[PDB]
Design a protein around this ligand. Sequence first.
Ligand SMILES: [Ca+2]
Ligand SMILES: [Ca+2]
Length: 144
Amino acid sequence: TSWRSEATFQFTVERFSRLSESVLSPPCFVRNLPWKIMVMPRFYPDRPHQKSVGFFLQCNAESDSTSWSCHAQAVLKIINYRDDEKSFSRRISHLFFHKENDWGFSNFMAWSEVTDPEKGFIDDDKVTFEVFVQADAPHGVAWD
Ligand SMILES: [Ca+2]
Ligand SMILES: [Ca+2]
């Protein structure tokens, strides 16, 4: 159910080379909360072309609630279509709540690397992002 404790979901960004804003994946429910992948181009002077791929995990952002929380561990990965041994991923641990509903990397990968038609992260101008997330939740199992 949507109350599962963990899940793995993907988000394929099409016409990637033309991405000019931040885009969100549809919601994946874990612990009855909507989790989404956020992807956007970011400016980094030292990178080749001063451009990098921003990749973040977002939780329950549309809710107006200010009384929720979810501590989660996750793996943020850009899938390598050709070799599963060559995918690039980074792990995070963060307490998600209304004031800090997203967490990730603004310089996840060089824009020139992800779009290199020879490295295996892009195909037909499409890049696929994946997140494995495990989250906890409050409950009433307590005792005197
Ligand atoms: Ca947007
Ligand atoms: Ca109880």
